[PDB]
Amino acid sequence: TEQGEDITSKKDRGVLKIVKRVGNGEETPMIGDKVYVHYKGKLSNGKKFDSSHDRNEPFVFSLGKGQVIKAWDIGVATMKKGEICHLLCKPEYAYGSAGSLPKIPSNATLFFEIELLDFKG
């Protein structure tokens, strides 16, 4: 609980969550919903590797369909509309030992700030 709440089903500390702003939303998105988020991702050296804010449009994906790294299918499923959270995503829940060059190094813990903007069934 020092670095956040373990939200993994295994309780292996692989995805840790800190709420930054509570959503006024009531339900989480459901599997298959189209979800709309803003995010900023940083490496452990503090370097921003990507941000939807920098494109001035949301990132959109279907929840729970393996369209994104595991940490996101887990983390976004816990969020309510309007919520902002920080997610610490160990490599086993992200890009693993390979990484994804050039932007993601090998064995990289990823640090996301995610805002849940909307979702639609």
Ligand SMILES: COc1ccc(OCCN2C[C@H]([C@H](O)CO)[C@H]3CCC[C@@H](C2=O)N3S(=O)(=O)c2cc(Cl)cc(Cl)c2)cc1OC
């Ligand atoms: C089922 O397993 C995966 C499914 C998809 C995977 O990567 C592509 C999807 N993706 C990329 C998006 C953006 O489209 C990239 O600009 C982005 C947001 C959603 C989470 C994650 C992300 O999951 N990434 S990212 O911020 O971790 C990311 C940014 C950049 Cl610049 C490069 C890469 Cl490789 C990842 C990766 C997966 O496993 C490693």
